[PDB]
Amino acid sequence: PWARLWALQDGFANLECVNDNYWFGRDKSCEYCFDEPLLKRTDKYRTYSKKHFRIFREVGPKNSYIAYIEDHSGNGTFVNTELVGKGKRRPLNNNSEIALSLSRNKVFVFFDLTVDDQSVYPKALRDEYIMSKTLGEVKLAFERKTCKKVAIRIISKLNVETEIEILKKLNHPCIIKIKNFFDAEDYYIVLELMEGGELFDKVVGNKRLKEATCKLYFYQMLLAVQYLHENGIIHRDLKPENVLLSSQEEDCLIKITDFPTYLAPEVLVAGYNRAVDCWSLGVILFICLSGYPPFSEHRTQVSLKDQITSGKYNFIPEVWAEVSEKALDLVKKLLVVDPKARFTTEEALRHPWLQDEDMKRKFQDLLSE
Amino acid sequence: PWARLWALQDGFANLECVNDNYWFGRDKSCEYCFDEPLLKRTDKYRTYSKKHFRIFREVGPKNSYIAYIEDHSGNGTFVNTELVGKGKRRPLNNNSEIALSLSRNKVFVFFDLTVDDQSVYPKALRDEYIMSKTLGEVKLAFERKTCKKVAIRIISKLNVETEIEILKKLNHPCIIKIKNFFDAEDYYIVLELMEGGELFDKVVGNKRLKEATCKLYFYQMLLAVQYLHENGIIHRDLKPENVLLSSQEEDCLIKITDFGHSKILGETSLMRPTYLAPEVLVAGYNRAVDCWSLGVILFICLSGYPPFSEHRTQVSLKDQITSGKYNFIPEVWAEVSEKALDLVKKLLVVDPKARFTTEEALRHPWLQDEDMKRKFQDLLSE
């Protein structure tokens, strides 16, 4: 049952569209025939054609099914007032009003039933999950029982299958959990879904975060990246929008996902080592403390890809005037052009700035949830 | 009006949902009250609660609006048979059947009206196009008058518009036509949309194409790339999925897309796996990179497998390319002509100065085939 037709006048009955084609008209051979005796006395009956119009489903060569209406009437078939026209066809969208002979003469409402159709999705998933909106191919879903939001990555049509198992083994509070996996035909990876949104939204609009908060998030970030590293994973693309926040509250758990500036200097001139993630965290810290990126073109004044390579980052003293020396120093030691000389995650965790049991206790507290 | 409720029993009336919340029940304070006199005599009336259930819209912190139903009834609110449960909530999807007190007792059908809502798109676009299904963001759309299927690439949040005008200047039958552009909310780029899908789908699953067909497609490919070159465009990322086929038929026109990586006149397109050239691993942005790519495409086409892939410790993929030692399975290449293998060879040279050019490739013995060239001319007559 791919479409519903909802009658809007007495003479007409509702139609469930299961078949691939439906003809409408007074002709006895029409799947939907107007010949009903109540309908025959509506005077406007005589204005209806023998084969008035047809609705049909066609497979568009994208594995998608498109509904069309096709006017064959002398007096017109109208979709939301607009006349289709004798011999013309047009796509039939959800909530279309079908009018006959007159523009205002509404007869049906058309509803597409293949919108949040669960039939597409495999049985094993549908038993645990309700599928919702696309979050742009990743979808929002709900646990049938607990009604808790989750995210589901979907992939497409051998070896990148146990790679999922290894990701599901990863267990760290500052890292997105692979809550569930479904291999049916497309790969369905159920993931955790952070509510507090992206750390990106928190620094957008040239505003900066509280230094205390930066430290709290950055500590978590460091822990997470370090864990990844010793689990043989280099993140390789680490940014404000990859860092998710657990709640609306400023004191919250940070979680990393996804396995423009943030490209490392060494990765511009294998060169795929851990230090690239450190560079990235450096850039994240910088944006967090300052509220602006360490690199951007403006004019002819040095290319962005040249700025990074020389290592000369954008330094606005007035902004950094109210950011502690150690905070600036960490960022400095983290944004070294020479990767051999760049700070490592261990080194960063030893840095004076993070020598702060006050926030560390805050972090432990947050783990108790 | 974000949702429709369609009554399925006489006592009930339809509901248009415009407000953010609607309570249902017998209590007079419910936005949808059951107290109607026809409804009062349906005996099952007495099984309905005072505040039976509510439907409401909530802004999920993604600029998206999610519908929920929430059961508060003693006897149950059911969504598609499934019981919601006293005090529980759940997302309410399109075409949900709401049943009261009994699982089978259907009362409403719920329809989401923010589904194929056209209000999202700019008027200029809607005047000419009916937007349809997504194809992953690139959505399908229909020319309002002709009903011609076209593709519309939608983007995100200055001069990335001149680029469009330039790409619009490109006029070759083997290159995707940019039918239109809209700068408003997101940048909308209306494109031709080939009916035959990607050349990628044609070689997927370790299967190879007919050698005759390869030649037909590869000729076209060569022409297209050459044209691009002499129009100051280096494609820079050329692959099976960038090559589109005009129809289901094996003999068809080939069209090239994606100038998202290309460098247009002087600059890199402001829109900004194996197909990386050896020189571009060690400016180094010359035409010869496209030749390398076409070489790799030819290789995949004829053989049905890629010239490079890691397998094990046995040489890295990025090292294979640089030494130029491609994967050669004699049993596969046993039924591919010598000239075909020779073209691929001359096209996959490590030294870019020594690599074949598009002109050189078109002079190659393999493409000295007026039989297929006549076939191509035929296809132009359409």
mmCIF file of N, CA, C and O in Angstrom, chain A residues 4 6 8 58 60-62 64-66 68 82 88-91 93-95 97 109 111-116 118 130-133 135 140 142 144-145 147 149 157 195 248 269 272 305, chain B residues 4 6-8 58 61-62 64-66 68 82 88-91 93-95 97 109 111-113 115-116 118 130-133 135 140 142 144-145 147 149 193 195 200 204 248 272 282 318:
data_model
loop_
_atom_site.group_PDB
_atom_site.id
_atom_site.type_symbol
_atom_site.label_atom_id
_atom_site.label_comp_id
_atom_site.label_asym_id
_atom_site.label_seq_id
_atom_site.Cartn_x
_atom_site.Cartn_y
_atom_site.Cartn_z
ATOM 1 N N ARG A 4 -2.486 6.666 -0.325
ATOM 2 C CA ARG A 4 -3.882 6.797 0.065
ATOM 3 C C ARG A 4 -4.579 7.911 -0.692
ATOM 4 O O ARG A 4 -4.036 9.003 -0.842
ATOM 5 N N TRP A 6 -7.978 10.072 -0.325
ATOM 6 C CA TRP A 6 -9.046 10.378 0.611
ATOM 7 C C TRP A 6 -10.168 11.173 -0.057
ATOM 8 O O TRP A 6 -9.974 12.326 -0.466
ATOM 9 N N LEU A 8 -13.432 13.371 -0.765
ATOM 10 C CA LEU A 8 -13.826 14.625 -0.152
ATOM 11 C C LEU A 8 -15.257 15.001 -0.511
ATOM 12 O O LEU A 8 -15.749 16.047 -0.086
ATOM 13 N N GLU A 58 5.981 4.672 -10.669
ATOM 14 C CA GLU A 58 7.007 4.314 -11.621
ATOM 15 C C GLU A 58 8.333 4.266 -10.898
ATOM 16 O O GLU A 58 8.647 5.153 -10.104
ATOM 17 N N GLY A 60 11.764 5.144 -10.736
ATOM 18 C CA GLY A 60 12.837 5.991 -11.239
ATOM 19 C C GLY A 60 14.132 5.224 -11.022
ATOM 20 O O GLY A 60 14.323 4.648 -9.944
ATOM 21 N N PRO A 61 15.023 5.192 -12.042
ATOM 22 C CA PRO A 61 16.269 4.374 -12.059
ATOM 23 C C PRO A 61 17.297 4.736 -10.973
ATOM 24 O O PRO A 61 18.508 4.790 -11.246
ATOM 25 N N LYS A 62 16.796 4.967 -9.757
ATOM 26 C CA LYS A 62 17.590 5.348 -8.587
ATOM 27 C C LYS A 62 17.162 4.483 -7.393
ATOM 28 O O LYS A 62 17.488 4.784 -6.237
ATOM 29 N N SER A 64 14.230 4.445 -6.458
ATOM 30 C CA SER A 64 13.177 5.265 -5.877
ATOM 31 C C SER A 64 11.890 5.124 -6.692
ATOM 32 O O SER A 64 11.931 4.922 -7.911
ATOM 33 N N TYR A 65 10.752 5.219 -6.008
ATOM 34 C CA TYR A 65 9.442 5.133 -6.658
ATOM 35 C C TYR A 65 8.710 6.466 -6.616
ATOM 36 O O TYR A 65 8.434 7.000 -5.537
ATOM 37 N N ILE A 66 8.402 6.989 -7.802
ATOM 38 C CA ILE A 66 7.781 8.294 -7.944
ATOM 39 C C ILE A 66 6.322 8.128 -8.359
ATOM 40 O O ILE A 66 6.017 7.334 -9.254
ATOM 41 N N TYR A 68 2.948 9.602 -10.129
ATOM 42 C CA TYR A 68 2.549 10.558 -11.137
ATOM 43 C C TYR A 68 1.040 10.560 -11.267
ATOM 44 O O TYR A 68 0.384 9.529 -11.069
ATOM 45 N N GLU A 82 -3.903 23.834 -9.763
ATOM 46 C CA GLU A 82 -3.184 23.836 -11.036
ATOM 47 C C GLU A 82 -3.666 22.727 -11.957
ATOM 48 O O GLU A 82 -3.796 21.581 -11.542
ATOM 49 N N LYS A 88 -1.042 15.474 -20.490
ATOM 50 C CA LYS A 88 0.133 15.794 -19.676
ATOM 51 C C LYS A 88 0.209 14.914 -18.410
ATOM 52 O O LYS A 88 -0.800 14.369 -17.923
ATOM 53 N N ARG A 89 1.422 14.771 -17.887
ATOM 54 C CA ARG A 89 1.623 14.133 -16.597
ATOM 55 C C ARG A 89 2.447 15.036 -15.693
ATOM 56 O O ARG A 89 3.073 15.992 -16.160
ATOM 57 N N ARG A 90 2.418 14.743 -14.397
ATOM 58 C CA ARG A 90 3.246 15.443 -13.432
ATOM 59 C C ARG A 90 3.371 14.640 -12.142
ATOM 60 O O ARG A 90 2.476 13.866 -11.795
ATOM 61 N N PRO A 91 4.495 14.814 -11.432
ATOM 62 C CA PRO A 91 4.705 14.173 -10.163
ATOM 63 C C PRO A 91 3.598 14.511 -9.220
ATOM 64 O O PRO A 91 3.100 15.630 -9.237
ATOM 65 N N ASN A 93 2.865 14.807 -5.417
ATOM 66 C CA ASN A 93 3.462 14.850 -4.080
ATOM 67 C C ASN A 93 2.491 14.523 -2.943
ATOM 68 O O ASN A 93 1.276 14.425 -3.157
ATOM 69 N N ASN A 94 3.026 14.358 -1.731
ATOM 70 C CA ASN A 94 2.192 14.127 -0.552
ATOM 71 C C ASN A 94 1.222 15.284 -0.347
ATOM 72 O O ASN A 94 1.551 16.427 -0.661
ATOM 73 N N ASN A 95 0.026 14.982 0.151
ATOM 74 C CA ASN A 95 -0.990 15.998 0.430
ATOM 75 C C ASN A 95 -1.379 16.836 -0.794
ATOM 76 O O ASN A 95 -1.613 18.040 -0.696
ATOM 77 N N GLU A 97 -4.139 17.859 -3.556
ATOM 78 C CA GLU A 97 -5.588 17.847 -3.705
ATOM 79 C C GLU A 97 -5.947 17.663 -5.166
ATOM 80 O O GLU A 97 -5.522 18.443 -6.025
ATOM 81 N N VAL A 109 -7.754 13.746 -1.635
ATOM 82 C CA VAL A 109 -6.437 14.133 -1.155
ATOM 83 C C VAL A 109 -5.524 12.943 -1.320
ATOM 84 O O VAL A 109 -5.880 11.816 -0.961
ATOM 85 N N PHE A 111 -2.012 11.010 -0.493
ATOM 86 C CA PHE A 111 -0.986 10.876 0.510
ATOM 87 C C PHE A 111 0.002 9.785 0.121
ATOM 88 O O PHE A 111 -0.387 8.648 -0.171
ATOM 89 N N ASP A 112 1.282 10.145 0.107
ATOM 90 C CA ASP A 112 2.354 9.190 -0.119
ATOM 91 C C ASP A 112 2.563 8.394 1.156
ATOM 92 O O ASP A 112 2.723 8.971 2.232
ATOM 93 N N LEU A 113 2.554 7.071 1.042
ATOM 94 C CA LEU A 113 2.723 6.215 2.214
ATOM 95 C C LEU A 113 4.148 5.707 2.367
ATOM 96 O O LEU A 113 4.514 5.139 3.410
ATOM 97 N N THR A 114 4.951 5.921 1.330
ATOM 98 C CA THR A 114 6.371 5.613 1.394
ATOM 99 C C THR A 114 7.158 6.865 1.802
ATOM 100 O O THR A 114 7.898 7.432 0.986
ATOM 101 N N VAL A 115 6.999 7.286 3.063
ATOM 102 C CA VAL A 115 7.707 8.440 3.619
ATOM 103 C C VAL A 115 8.578 7.948 4.764
ATOM 104 O O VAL A 115 9.806 7.903 4.651
ATOM 105 N N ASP A 116 7.945 7.576 5.866
ATOM 106 C CA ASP A 116 8.662 6.923 6.939
ATOM 107 C C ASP A 116 8.284 5.448 6.943
ATOM 108 O O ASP A 116 7.957 4.869 7.985
ATOM 109 N N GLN A 118 8.854 1.734 7.117
ATOM 110 C CA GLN A 118 9.824 0.927 7.853
ATOM 111 C C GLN A 118 10.173 -0.358 7.106
ATOM 112 O O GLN A 118 11.146 -1.022 7.447
ATOM 113 N N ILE A 130 12.567 2.796 16.165
ATOM 114 C CA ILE A 130 11.675 3.556 15.313
ATOM 115 C C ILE A 130 12.537 4.549 14.560
ATOM 116 O O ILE A 130 13.340 5.274 15.163
ATOM 117 N N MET A 131 12.376 4.568 13.239
ATOM 118 C CA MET A 131 13.169 5.447 12.385
ATOM 119 C C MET A 131 12.540 6.808 12.212
ATOM 120 O O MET A 131 11.352 6.923 11.911
ATOM 121 N N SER A 132 13.347 7.841 12.399
ATOM 122 C CA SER A 132 12.854 9.208 12.288
ATOM 123 C C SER A 132 13.570 9.971 11.161
ATOM 124 O O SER A 132 13.897 9.380 10.119
ATOM 125 N N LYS A 133 13.814 11.268 11.379
ATOM 126 C CA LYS A 133 14.340 12.174 10.355
ATOM 127 C C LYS A 133 15.752 11.804 9.912
ATOM 128 O O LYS A 133 16.477 11.118 10.640
ATOM 129 N N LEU A 135 19.368 13.110 9.576
ATOM 130 C CA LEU A 135 20.191 14.165 10.116
ATOM 131 C C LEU A 135 21.237 14.538 9.072
ATOM 132 O O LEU A 135 22.307 15.032 9.406
ATOM 133 N N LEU A 140 18.102 9.903 12.588
ATOM 134 C CA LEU A 140 17.628 9.831 13.961
ATOM 135 C C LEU A 140 16.694 8.629 14.127
ATOM 136 O O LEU A 140 15.869 8.342 13.248
ATOM 137 N N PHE A 142 14.676 5.972 17.434
ATOM 138 C CA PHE A 142 14.289 5.823 18.836
ATOM 139 C C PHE A 142 14.241 4.367 19.251
ATOM 140 O O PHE A 142 13.826 3.511 18.473
ATOM 141 N N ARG A 144 12.539 1.376 20.745
ATOM 142 C CA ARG A 144 11.103 1.066 20.865
ATOM 143 C C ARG A 144 10.644 1.135 22.315
ATOM 144 O O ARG A 144 9.600 1.712 22.615
ATOM 145 N N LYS A 145 11.453 0.570 23.207
ATOM 146 C CA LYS A 145 11.091 0.420 24.611
ATOM 147 C C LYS A 145 11.324 1.703 25.407
ATOM 148 O O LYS A 145 10.374 2.297 25.911
ATOM 149 N N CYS A 147 12.370 4.645 24.433
ATOM 150 C CA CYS A 147 12.170 5.885 23.662
ATOM 151 C C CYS A 147 13.327 6.878 23.821
ATOM 152 O O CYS A 147 13.135 8.044 24.178
ATOM 153 N N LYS A 149 16.669 8.688 22.055
ATOM 154 C CA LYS A 149 17.209 9.044 20.754
ATOM 155 C C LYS A 149 18.512 8.289 20.501
ATOM 156 O O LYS A 149 19.329 8.131 21.402
ATOM 157 N N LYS A 157 25.875 -0.826 -0.894
ATOM 158 C CA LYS A 157 26.232 -2.173 -1.380
ATOM 159 C C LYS A 157 27.735 -2.482 -1.305
ATOM 160 O O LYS A 157 28.552 -1.620 -0.972
ATOM 161 N N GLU A 195 23.134 14.968 22.685
ATOM 162 C CA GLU A 195 22.067 15.944 22.763
ATOM 163 C C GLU A 195 22.547 17.401 22.710
ATOM 164 O O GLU A 195 21.916 18.202 21.980
ATOM 165 N N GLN A 248 23.099 20.445 27.673
ATOM 166 C CA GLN A 248 23.089 21.901 27.557
ATOM 167 C C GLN A 248 24.047 22.567 28.536
ATOM 168 O O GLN A 248 24.592 23.631 28.248
ATOM 169 N N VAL A 269 53.046 19.649 2.882
ATOM 170 C CA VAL A 269 54.229 19.599 2.002
ATOM 171 C C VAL A 269 54.298 18.278 1.229
ATOM 172 O O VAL A 269 53.638 18.118 0.204
ATOM 173 N N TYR A 272 51.687 10.424 8.534
ATOM 174 C CA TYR A 272 50.338 10.039 8.989
ATOM 175 C C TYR A 272 50.312 9.658 10.477
ATOM 176 O O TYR A 272 49.396 8.966 10.938
ATOM 177 N N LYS A 305 47.287 28.364 3.389
ATOM 178 C CA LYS A 305 48.132 27.185 3.350
ATOM 179 C C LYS A 305 49.605 27.533 3.547
ATOM 180 O O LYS A 305 50.409 26.660 3.863
ATOM 181 N N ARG B 4 -1.718 16.303 9.682
ATOM 182 C CA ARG B 4 -3.125 15.998 9.486
ATOM 183 C C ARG B 4 -3.527 14.769 10.242
ATOM 184 O O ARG B 4 -2.813 13.771 10.249
ATOM 185 N N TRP B 6 -6.591 12.103 10.254
ATOM 186 C CA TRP B 6 -7.720 11.682 9.453
ATOM 187 C C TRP B 6 -8.585 10.693 10.232
ATOM 188 O O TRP B 6 -8.155 9.576 10.529
ATOM 189 N N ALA B 7 -9.794 11.134 10.579
ATOM 190 C CA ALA B 7 -10.738 10.339 11.344
ATOM 191 C C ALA B 7 -11.146 9.107 10.558
ATOM 192 O O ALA B 7 -11.301 9.171 9.332
ATOM 193 N N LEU B 8 -11.319 7.995 11.265
ATOM 194 C CA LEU B 8 -11.645 6.724 10.631
ATOM 195 C C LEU B 8 -12.942 6.112 11.169
ATOM 196 O O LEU B 8 -13.325 5.008 10.771
ATOM 197 N N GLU B 58 7.839 19.105 18.818
ATOM 198 C CA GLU B 58 8.929 19.578 19.638
ATOM 199 C C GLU B 58 10.118 19.859 18.753
ATOM 200 O O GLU B 58 10.450 19.062 17.874
ATOM 201 N N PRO B 61 16.965 19.922 18.880
ATOM 202 C CA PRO B 61 18.074 20.913 18.772
ATOM 203 C C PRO B 61 18.970 20.758 17.532
ATOM 204 O O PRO B 61 20.194 20.874 17.628
ATOM 205 N N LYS B 62 18.334 20.510 16.386
ATOM 206 C CA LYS B 62 18.993 20.308 15.094
ATOM 207 C C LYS B 62 18.266 21.147 14.033
ATOM 208 O O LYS B 62 18.459 20.949 12.827
ATOM 209 N N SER B 64 15.245 20.781 13.529
ATOM 210 C CA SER B 64 14.248 19.834 13.044
ATOM 211 C C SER B 64 13.094 19.733 14.038
ATOM 212 O O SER B 64 13.289 19.887 15.248
ATOM 213 N N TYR B 65 11.894 19.485 13.520
ATOM 214 C CA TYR B 65 10.702 19.355 14.355
ATOM 215 C C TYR B 65 10.178 17.931 14.321
ATOM 216 O O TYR B 65 9.818 17.409 13.259
ATOM 217 N N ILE B 66 10.131 17.317 15.501
ATOM 218 C CA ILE B 66 9.711 15.924 15.651
ATOM 219 C C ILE B 66 8.317 15.837 16.285
ATOM 220 O O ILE B 66 8.023 16.531 17.264
ATOM 221 N N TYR B 68 5.502 13.829 18.403
ATOM 222 C CA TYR B 68 5.401 12.765 19.401
ATOM 223 C C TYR B 68 3.953 12.529 19.742
ATOM 224 O O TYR B 68 3.144 13.450 19.699
ATOM 225 N N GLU B 82 0.811 -1.270 18.068
ATOM 226 C CA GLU B 82 1.694 -1.212 19.221
ATOM 227 C C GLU B 82 1.203 -0.221 20.279
ATOM 228 O O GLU B 82 0.860 0.922 19.971
ATOM 229 N N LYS B 88 3.988 6.939 28.825
ATOM 230 C CA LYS B 88 5.060 6.847 27.825
ATOM 231 C C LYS B 88 4.823 7.761 26.604
ATOM 232 O O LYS B 88 3.689 8.133 26.284
ATOM 233 N N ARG B 89 5.910 8.127 25.938
ATOM 234 C CA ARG B 89 5.821 8.846 24.679
ATOM 235 C C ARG B 89 6.605 8.104 23.602
ATOM 236 O O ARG B 89 7.415 7.223 23.902
ATOM 237 N N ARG B 90 6.327 8.436 22.346
ATOM 238 C CA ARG B 90 7.101 7.926 21.232
ATOM 239 C C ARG B 90 6.927 8.791 19.988
ATOM 240 O O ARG B 90 5.890 9.447 19.827
ATOM 241 N N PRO B 91 7.958 8.815 19.116
ATOM 242 C CA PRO B 91 7.884 9.547 17.875
ATOM 243 C C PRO B 91 6.692 9.089 17.083
ATOM 244 O O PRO B 91 6.367 7.920 17.097
ATOM 245 N N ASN B 93 5.471 8.879 13.404
ATOM 246 C CA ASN B 93 5.867 8.982 11.999
ATOM 247 C C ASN B 93 4.700 9.207 11.038
ATOM 248 O O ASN B 93 3.535 9.146 11.438
ATOM 249 N N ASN B 94 5.016 9.470 9.770
ATOM 250 C CA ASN B 94 3.983 9.650 8.750
ATOM 251 C C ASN B 94 3.172 8.377 8.600
ATOM 252 O O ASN B 94 3.714 7.289 8.777
ATOM 253 N N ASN B 95 1.883 8.508 8.289
ATOM 254 C CA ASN B 95 0.993 7.356 8.104
ATOM 255 C C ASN B 95 0.929 6.408 9.324
ATOM 256 O O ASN B 95 0.884 5.184 9.194
ATOM 257 N N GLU B 97 -1.219 4.877 12.385
ATOM 258 C CA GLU B 97 -2.613 4.652 12.731
ATOM 259 C C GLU B 97 -2.775 4.722 14.226
ATOM 260 O O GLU B 97 -2.148 3.965 14.968
ATOM 261 N N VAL B 109 -5.631 8.446 11.238
ATOM 262 C CA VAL B 109 -4.358 8.295 10.556
ATOM 263 C C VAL B 109 -3.610 9.603 10.681
ATOM 264 O O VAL B 109 -4.179 10.672 10.485
ATOM 265 N N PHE B 111 -0.601 12.076 9.477
ATOM 266 C CA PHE B 111 0.237 12.430 8.358
ATOM 267 C C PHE B 111 1.105 13.648 8.660
ATOM 268 O O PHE B 111 0.607 14.706 9.057
ATOM 269 N N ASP B 112 2.410 13.480 8.477
ATOM 270 C CA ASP B 112 3.367 14.567 8.604
ATOM 271 C C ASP B 112 3.279 15.437 7.361
ATOM 272 O O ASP B 112 3.366 14.936 6.248
ATOM 273 N N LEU B 113 3.098 16.735 7.551
ATOM 274 C CA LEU B 113 2.955 17.649 6.427
ATOM 275 C C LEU B 113 4.251 18.380 6.122
ATOM 276 O O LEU B 113 4.374 19.038 5.088
ATOM 277 N N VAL B 115 6.984 17.078 5.019
ATOM 278 C CA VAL B 115 7.641 15.918 4.371
ATOM 279 C C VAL B 115 8.200 16.350 3.029
ATOM 280 O O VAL B 115 9.411 16.502 2.882
ATOM 281 N N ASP B 116 7.318 16.549 2.055
ATOM 282 C CA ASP B 116 7.726 17.155 0.794
ATOM 283 C C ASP B 116 7.228 18.590 0.738
ATOM 284 O O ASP B 116 6.639 19.029 -0.250
ATOM 285 N N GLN B 118 7.368 22.272 0.138
ATOM 286 C CA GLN B 118 8.076 23.089 -0.839
ATOM 287 C C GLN B 118 8.449 24.472 -0.292
ATOM 288 O O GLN B 118 9.274 25.176 -0.893
ATOM 289 N N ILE B 130 9.475 21.182 -9.444
ATOM 290 C CA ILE B 130 8.874 20.419 -8.366
ATOM 291 C C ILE B 130 9.993 19.550 -7.805
ATOM 292 O O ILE B 130 10.584 18.758 -8.535
ATOM 293 N N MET B 131 10.300 19.701 -6.522
ATOM 294 C CA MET B 131 11.381 18.934 -5.909
ATOM 295 C C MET B 131 10.885 17.571 -5.519
ATOM 296 O O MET B 131 9.779 17.448 -4.993
ATOM 297 N N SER B 132 11.700 16.551 -5.775
ATOM 298 C CA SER B 132 11.315 15.172 -5.480
ATOM 299 C C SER B 132 12.258 14.496 -4.478
ATOM 300 O O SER B 132 12.728 15.132 -3.529
ATOM 301 N N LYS B 133 12.524 13.209 -4.693
ATOM 302 C CA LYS B 133 13.295 12.386 -3.760
ATOM 303 C C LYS B 133 14.760 12.760 -3.756
ATOM 304 O O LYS B 133 15.282 13.241 -4.755
ATOM 305 N N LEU B 135 18.846 11.889 -3.558
ATOM 306 C CA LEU B 135 19.717 10.871 -4.128
ATOM 307 C C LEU B 135 21.089 11.023 -3.463
ATOM 308 O O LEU B 135 22.131 10.680 -4.050
ATOM 309 N N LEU B 140 16.299 14.926 -6.544
ATOM 310 C CA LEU B 140 15.638 14.847 -7.832
ATOM 311 C C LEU B 140 14.617 15.944 -7.876
ATOM 312 O O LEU B 140 14.069 16.315 -6.842
ATOM 313 N N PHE B 142 11.643 18.016 -10.850
ATOM 314 C CA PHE B 142 10.962 17.965 -12.123
ATOM 315 C C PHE B 142 10.729 19.367 -12.665
ATOM 316 O O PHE B 142 10.233 20.233 -11.954
ATOM 317 N N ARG B 144 8.730 22.009 -14.224
ATOM 318 C CA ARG B 144 7.296 22.157 -14.025
ATOM 319 C C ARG B 144 6.490 21.950 -15.316
ATOM 320 O O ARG B 144 5.474 21.235 -15.316
ATOM 321 N N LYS B 145 6.963 22.552 -16.409
ATOM 322 C CA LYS B 145 6.251 22.503 -17.689
ATOM 323 C C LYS B 145 6.487 21.198 -18.464
ATOM 324 O O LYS B 145 5.528 20.521 -18.838
ATOM 325 N N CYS B 147 8.176 18.432 -17.380
ATOM 326 C CA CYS B 147 8.252 17.261 -16.495
ATOM 327 C C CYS B 147 9.556 16.472 -16.743
ATOM 328 O O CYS B 147 9.640 15.267 -16.490
ATOM 329 N N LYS B 149 12.996 15.170 -15.818
ATOM 330 C CA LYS B 149 13.731 14.882 -14.599
ATOM 331 C C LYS B 149 15.088 15.590 -14.665
ATOM 332 O O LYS B 149 15.810 15.486 -15.658
ATOM 333 N N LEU B 193 21.054 15.291 -15.188
ATOM 334 C CA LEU B 193 20.557 13.964 -14.707
ATOM 335 C C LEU B 193 20.448 12.889 -15.785
ATOM 336 O O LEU B 193 19.436 12.809 -16.488
ATOM 337 N N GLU B 195 19.939 9.186 -17.268
ATOM 338 C CA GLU B 195 19.041 8.099 -16.927
ATOM 339 C C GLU B 195 19.807 6.766 -16.635
ATOM 340 O O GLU B 195 19.269 5.950 -15.893
ATOM 341 N N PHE B 200 30.394 3.498 -12.691
ATOM 342 C CA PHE B 200 30.842 2.715 -11.545
ATOM 343 C C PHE B 200 30.005 1.452 -11.335
ATOM 344 O O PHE B 200 30.548 0.368 -11.151
ATOM 345 N N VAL B 204 31.153 -2.611 -11.006
ATOM 346 C CA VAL B 204 31.094 -3.079 -9.616
ATOM 347 C C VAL B 204 30.859 -4.594 -9.541
ATOM 348 O O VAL B 204 30.164 -5.171 -10.384
ATOM 349 N N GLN B 248 20.181 2.991 -20.221
ATOM 350 C CA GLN B 248 20.423 1.606 -19.819
ATOM 351 C C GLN B 248 21.238 0.846 -20.857
ATOM 352 O O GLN B 248 21.997 -0.066 -20.512
ATOM 353 N N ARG B 272 35.377 23.455 -3.297
ATOM 354 C CA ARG B 272 36.271 22.817 -2.368
ATOM 355 C C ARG B 272 36.569 23.832 -1.286
ATOM 356 O O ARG B 272 37.005 23.481 -0.202
ATOM 357 N N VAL B 282 54.796 12.536 -4.272
ATOM 358 C CA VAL B 282 56.136 12.919 -3.867
ATOM 359 C C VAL B 282 56.196 14.424 -3.611
ATOM 360 O O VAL B 282 56.053 14.875 -2.476
ATOM 361 N N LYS B 318 50.300 3.420 -1.668
ATOM 362 C CA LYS B 318 50.926 4.674 -2.066
ATOM 363 C C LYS B 318 52.359 4.469 -2.561
ATOM 364 O O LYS B 318 52.917 5.341 -3.224
#
